[PDB]
Amino acid sequence: AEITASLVKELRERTGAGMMDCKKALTEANGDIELAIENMRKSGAIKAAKKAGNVAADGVIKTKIDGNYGIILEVNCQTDFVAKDAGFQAFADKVLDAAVAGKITDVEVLKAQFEEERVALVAKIGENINIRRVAALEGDVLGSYQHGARIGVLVAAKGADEELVKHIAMHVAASKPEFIKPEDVSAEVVEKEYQVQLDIAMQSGKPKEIAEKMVEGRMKKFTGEVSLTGQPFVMEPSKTVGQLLKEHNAEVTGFIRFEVGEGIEKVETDFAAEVAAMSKQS
Amino acid sequence: AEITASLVKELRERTGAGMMDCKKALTEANGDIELAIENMRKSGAIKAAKKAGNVAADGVIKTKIDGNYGIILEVNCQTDFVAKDAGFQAFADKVLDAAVAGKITDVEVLKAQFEEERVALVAKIGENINIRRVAALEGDVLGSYQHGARIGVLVAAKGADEELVKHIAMHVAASKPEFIKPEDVSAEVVEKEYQVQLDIAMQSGKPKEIAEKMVEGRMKKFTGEVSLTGQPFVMEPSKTVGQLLKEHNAEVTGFIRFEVGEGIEKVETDFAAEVAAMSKQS
Amino acid sequence: KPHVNVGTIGHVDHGKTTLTAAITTVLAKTYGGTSHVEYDTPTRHYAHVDCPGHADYVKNMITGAAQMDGAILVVAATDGPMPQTREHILLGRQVGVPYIIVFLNKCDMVDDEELLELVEMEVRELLSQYDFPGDDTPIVRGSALKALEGDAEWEAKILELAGFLDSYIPEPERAIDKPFLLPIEDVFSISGRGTVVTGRVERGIIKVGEEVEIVGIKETQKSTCTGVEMFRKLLDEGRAGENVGVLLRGIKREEIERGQVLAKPGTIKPHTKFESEVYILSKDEGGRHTPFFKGYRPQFYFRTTDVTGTIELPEGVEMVMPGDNIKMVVTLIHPIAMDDGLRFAIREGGRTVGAGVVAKVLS
Amino acid sequence: KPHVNVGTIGHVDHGKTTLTAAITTVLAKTYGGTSHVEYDTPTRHYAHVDCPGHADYVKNMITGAAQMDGAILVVAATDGPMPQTREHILLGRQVGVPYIIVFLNKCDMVDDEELLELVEMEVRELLSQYDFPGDDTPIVRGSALKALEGDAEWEAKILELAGFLDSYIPEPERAIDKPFLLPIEDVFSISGRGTVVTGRVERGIIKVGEEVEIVGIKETQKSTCTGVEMFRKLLDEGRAGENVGVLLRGIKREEIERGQVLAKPGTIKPHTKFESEVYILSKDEGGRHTPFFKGYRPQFYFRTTDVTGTIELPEGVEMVMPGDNIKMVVTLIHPIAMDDGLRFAIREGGRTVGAGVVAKVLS
Known about the structure:
The complex is a heterotetramer, with two copies of chain A (282 residues) and two copies of chain C (363 residues). Chain A has 282 residues and is α+β, with helices and mostly antiparallel strands. Chain A has helices at residues 5-15, 19-29, 33-51, 80-84, 86-101, 107-125, 162-175, 187-203, 208-226, 241-247, 271-278; strands spanning 58-66, 69-77, 130-138, 141-147, 151-158, 232-233, 236-240, 251-259. Chain A has eleven helices and eight strands. In chain A, helix 2 crosses helix 3 and helix 5 runs antiparallel to helix 6 (107-125). Chain C has three domains: 1-172, Rossmann fold (3-Layer(aba) Sandwich), CATH 3.40.50.300; 175-270, Translation factors (Elongation Factor Tu (Ef-tu), domain 3); 271-362, Translation factors (Elongation Factor Tu (Ef-tu), domain 3), CATH 2.40.30.10. Chains C, D: Keywords: Acetylation, Antibiotic resistance, Cell inner membrane, Cell membrane, Cytoplasm, Elongation factor, GTP-binding, Hydrolase, Magnesium, Membrane, Metal-binding, Methylation, Nucleotide-binding, Phosphoprotein, Protein biosynthesis, RNA-binding.
């Protein structure tokens, strides 16, 4: 069947695929738009496989609380333009809902469940999209905080109202503690850190006596700085979150903080030199 | 000779020793002021020995430069009122000069040389006074910065003027770097710190591959935080001290920072409780 | 020679860097020959940047490093618009890029003009949806690779684009052409003749005899230019760029202050409230170490002085961290001469902790 | 009963604590009655702090944590003044302590009274050398150990000291006795009567019919109180400590503003330049994380409003770190009612990063 511009347009209208991709698919299907759609469906994976090589450091972090159950999710893409895109947003939200509905905390299953959709989405957008990680937090009182689509955090507490839990979530988003209380830092970590701070003092030419005495002091702070209760409340640095909690007879039982692209080495592109490399041809 | 109030005043206004210490020494010296001065020397060592057990966490940091040789020193006392005392200043300054003059970096030798004088001063000031430490910095161009009597800094540079060196000494005083350049931190400590960070990341629930890539990123700031050239210039945080130096074709060869009381307890007293502890019977 | 700032907006794989290379190579051989690129036509000089990120572009645009006069939407005809093309155009709308020219890339691979027709229809419709003259928008059907391959048939298309940059985008208005305005710095009197306000002429010309208006901080006032003097040389007029000292007529010193502005009567009005696009410096950029909240009351530095202000953060926003882009409705403690597009800095205790741009005057 | 704030200053081993233990003990045994102690005599109530350090005291005074009405210098008769005794008196001078009473401790251990004469003359000359009335200063010859031991002969000396605290240190002026002063917070217009200004009466009493001056920021104005009210009920007068709204005669709404002050005519003046004792908070106290330099221009919060100002640091001083005590000559951008002793907060973008006290008014 002759592939008219309108035929290609019709295929594209219902597939969201590229002008020429639609054209070529019809060439194979010989005008049968139905076969074309199926073929293109099979092609999506190859197109997605090609893009899988591209670094996806952008994206969004999403949080969702349903009772005493909450999920935090990271879905990546290449540019924030797509992170803003309705198609991407819809996919991310759908993954979130499923994650909460089915209590899914294992990314492998979640990835598996959305593989076909992801592939179809990537084929249209032309950017690597990837469900990176997902986690849940349970507690008496659950609160969340989104710092744009960039940072997301879940906070579980006891004897704390919504406003308190929101403030602690904001603090976690800003201060990145990795423990709840100082006493949660293993004696092992403390010892390792002691040695490190010791080697640094020593090389400084400091007398062993003075050096150790100093490090001994600096260590007493260490646990506080890496811990939620030991960190100064961002909204009022004159008190620690620990005091804030005591003033409210509250206790934090858990928290999780995700930030888009953590662990991914985003490259610092130099346009000027990139163009220069292209200017080789003449 | 008869020991009269007039005579005691003569020895006190010549020694600065306690009224009664003068009275007792004159009486036993039988009016001989010079002998009484000698008696007090003997008894003074015993008074200084008595005070020797008190914590002297206050004091001053002194710095003096002489061409390509610089000296930084710490002399302690119990209270700041004494640190601000002319006699104490006179003592610390004399110890400083001698250390520069004779290039004395061994605090034991310095202590030995000023022991008699220290005992005399302690006997008239009534506070534990101690020559705690001393070090020398050598370089092409030497600079110093005293932030009050509290913090003292010496800096060695190459191709840097008095003002730049001074500004760097101001930065060292404030930001406390421990290495000059980020590359100065040994691979042994960078690795040790990597492990500490990795342990904290792992316990945070982070999946291994993510936790490792995150720790990896934190190592770069680790070395930049502990090094002079990697830190943000205090007078202009938008640039590191390395950039400031590059734009001056200057280089830092070394630096030393002393701060009064470093590595000493900082006891803390409770006046009210102490008063109550004394309000026993009648 | 006119200076136009342009930029490329498009899909990562649609050939923006390639086209930009084709632009330099072709313009060079034909006429004589955030990081950016530069090239010239016989009429203008161009500063060309790339817009790889929305927030990224916004940040640069706020910090004074962007201000596009026209944008090139690079859409490869092999695919046509991508879903994110809406976001590419939407950014153009949000920052208010005045003109958009389209470059259909990879046209050499579209085995049918009818297909090139379809792609165009889509592009023009998307542009219209965001209020751009879709049907008046220059759309060049080119190919960056072939042009770069010296294929004179395609190089022609590159110059066609350069032609549109020259025609579609009009010559940016010159400062000398803009009405006279001078940001007042120091105000001193000579006695022998009159009061003098010092400053660099921001725009236009001030000639002796001309009347002016003192806008900002206090109720607007009018006065007459009784002499224009520059450093070590008296002249008859202060022009754009020239750091001068304007002598006025019968206006007492305590009536004119730093922060106020001299301007052609009627050309600029004072305001207290406005909506602004703001960027907060990160710690590494020399800004705040911690985030601020709703009660933040910094100073807004307009041209030559700080004016304290109250901030209205967006609904649902209660924390601004170093490195954030954010919209804020500000209420200054007193008026300051302002127009939309007016840049300002945010300072704390005298130090700059952020930068901003007046998006919409309110009061 | 009248409240008086006293403090002990003296050599570490001279018995400051012992003396204090003795004072509380004897007064209770006799009359039945920042980490301070408190004691009462038949006439007054005392709050007694110790001053172990110079910088600590200055900090605590500045942060309001402690400011003496009288100081008791404790010197043991056995030694007599120490070299650092001048450092003790010098702080007393530096922080404007009004009266210094001396208590010679361990007098029971000195044999010759002519020696006690010597010690007293040394103390008197030291005092005089720093402008304290050495000649009139009460020097009690005691023994805190013996008084504490119930030794009546020495307990009497404790009562003699308390007696000087009662007679030598003037009964502090109660706020209600001082000339009226109300820091304006909100201003309201009404029609039917006039403009109302709200605030908490700092000191004195404002009554209907009494004239008041509107001081600060703008040129002083004078008006008459037409009526006082609290919780919309028209009161008879407004006393110190009460929160009220003062109704004014012939004063327009926009003729008054927050930060201005209401006061008995001719009792307060607006000033722009002054010398101050300032304390900058440390990171752990919620203050700055980094040091500031010569060009720092924060806001000085005076009573109810901020006033930007520039600073002048002592010679040789080029950097101030969080946690530092420092004297500085401030120059406000506009006048604000003040006088020596007036405390204030230093802020950046609305947050307090330090505190200070107006030490000497310059302009």
